[PDB]
Amino acid sequence: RMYEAVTGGRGLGDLMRNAQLREYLPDDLRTVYDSANGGGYSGISGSINDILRDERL
Amino acid sequence: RMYEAVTGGRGLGDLMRNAQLREYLPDDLRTVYDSANGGGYSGISGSINDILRDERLNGSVADMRRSIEERSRTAAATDKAVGLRAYEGAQQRLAQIEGLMDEISRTQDQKAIEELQARIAGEQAAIQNETTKLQMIAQLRQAEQALISEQRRERNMRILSSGNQGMPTIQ
Amino acid sequence: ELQARIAGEQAAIQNETTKLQMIAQLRQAEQALISEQRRERNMRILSSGNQGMPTIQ
Amino acid sequence: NGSVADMRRSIEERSRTAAATDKAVGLRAYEGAQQRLAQIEGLMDEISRTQDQKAIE
Structure with a gap:
């Protein structure tokens, strides 16, 4: 029983793996400042357009 | 069997060591700002030259004005x-x-x-x-931000530059 | 643990x-956004499209 | 040091x-x-x- 307890893969280490959070920070910083239209990612674009339109005094 | 499973070097720990990420960052910080022509790396020098070329925009003064304002x-x-x-x-x-x-x-x-x-x-x-x-x-x-300020300097030096030769007409 | x-x-x-x-x-x-809004304000108050001139009476 | 025009070009290129x-x-x-x-x-x-x-x- 002790031997089977210590030595054997038992599932853990695969917790919250498939949940991806790398998708939130920018993927690549070559079109990051042109992302207002295309290149980069689209949620960034939506936020940029929202702030740019709303800050219009 | 238990002793064998506890004691003895068994390899894991040199996983994925072959790929080296040192060259991504500079080797030493002495030629990093001399890297326009030499010192650094050839690809990074190409990127520097390319970004300098793309930043050096052209066109009429109004186009540069609108582009700079929108860029900021x-x-x-x-x-x-x-x-x-x-x-x-x-x-x-x-x-x-x-x-x-x-x-x-x-x-x-x-x-x-x-x-x-x-x-x-x-x-x-x-x-x-x-x-x-x-x-x-x-x-x-x-x-x-420094690049935008440099573009602003480029425009207000282009307008005022001493090498201009034009003058409006009288009639 | x-x-x-x-x-x-x-x-x-x-x-x-x-x-x-x-x-x-x-x-x-x-802070950069505030500076940009200041610049936009001073453009609007100096805009060449301001064709209005106060009347004389 | 040197000619002042040399100084100007060197500064601009360095920036x-x-x-x-x-x-x-x-x-x-x-x-x-x-x-x-x-x-x-x-x-x-x-x-x-x-x-x-x-x-x-």
Whole structure:
């Protein structure tokens, strides 16, 4: 029983793996400042357009 | 069998060592700013030359004016939006950390808690990587602000330049 | 278990460091936004499209 | 030192080079960090399947 307890893969280490959070920070910083239209990612674009339109005094 | 499973070098620990990431960052900080022509690397020098070429925009003065104004506006807005999304990401990472802990409360076997400790170490590695990415984004932001100011200087030196020769007409 | 809990604690502290870096970045962005709004205001008050002139009486 | 025009051209070129080098090093380091994250994912996905306590340690 002790031997089977210590030595054997038992599932853990695969917790919250498939949940991806790398998708939130920018993927690549070559079109990051042109992302207002295309290149980069689209949620960034939506936020940029929202702030740019709303800050219009 | 138990002694064999506890004692004896068994390889794992040199996993994925062949790929080296040293060359991504400079070797020494003496020629990094001389790197326009030499010192650094050839690809990074190509990127420097290319970005200098693309920044040196042309056209009539009105086109450069509108381009610079829009560039500044969108730069500020992009900075704010990146901050927003990255904060949502940090909160999600905190949620994962709390989940990992309330999983740590319920591990029964020694190798289970060992694998979980290793997973937490990997989570710390991911968080360190996120911090490095934040630093690089901030540095890029400062560089691009400097570039916008340089474009402004280019325009107001082009207008006032001594090499002009035109003069309006009288009639 | 205590060693792994301390590891989790370090993870939380690193998360706090990330959030502080990010708040500083947002502060700089907000200052730049305020400067841009000032510039837009001084453009609107100096715009060449202002063809109006006060009357004489 | 030298001619003042030499000073002017040297300063202008040095400023442009400084800005461009800053941006380029930033980008290069960013894809480096992406490589690092891929390495981390690989390490964890391979650590889920160890067999002996010495291997996991």
